[PDB]
């Protein structure tokens, strides 16, 4: 689990979105595993605006933050998980590292701020849904 809190937006994995998220929907995209809902309180996070390929991510199933190198966001085949069938996921970055289903929502961060959240795992990789292209998260 986990979210990004930027402005009056809450960014969550689409598959973990609650009824309250869907009732306060701003934007969602199944292909990216993202959903954004509106918040009452302002959040603490800053979104990275950059093309970094190095950062640090939180792994709940290890209680640890790991430094990783990661691929640029691309359209990637993802094998079946407990929460999606085998399918193509867009705007996905991969790194070598540990990820289980419950790790989804952990933040990946670089020197510029939040890059994305954990969205995929298995076979010794961790996949992250990028948010750095969602420039509208920084306004309104
Ligand atoms: F790293 C740990 C070590 C022991 C217990 C718990 C943690 C994880 N701390 C969280 C805090 C909220 O943001 C994500 C990381
Ligand atoms: Zn960066």
Can you describe what's shown?
It is classed as hydrolase. The entry lists the keywords Diamond Light Source, I03, asap, Coxsackievirus A16, crystallographic fragment screening, PanDDA, Pandda2, XChemExplorer, viral protein, hydrolase. This protein has one helix and eleven strands. With 140 residues, the chain is mainly beta. It folds into two domains: 3-44, no CATH class; 45-140, no CATH class. The strands form two sheets. Strands 6-5-9-10-11-8-7 form a seven-stranded antiparallel sheet, with no helix packed on it. The longest helix is centred in the first third of the chain and has 5 residues, at 19-23. The two termini are 26 Å apart. 36% of the residues are buried. The structure holds N-[(2-fluorophenyl)methyl]oxan-4-amine and zinc ion (ZN). Residues 48, 50, 52, 110-112 line the site of zinc ion.
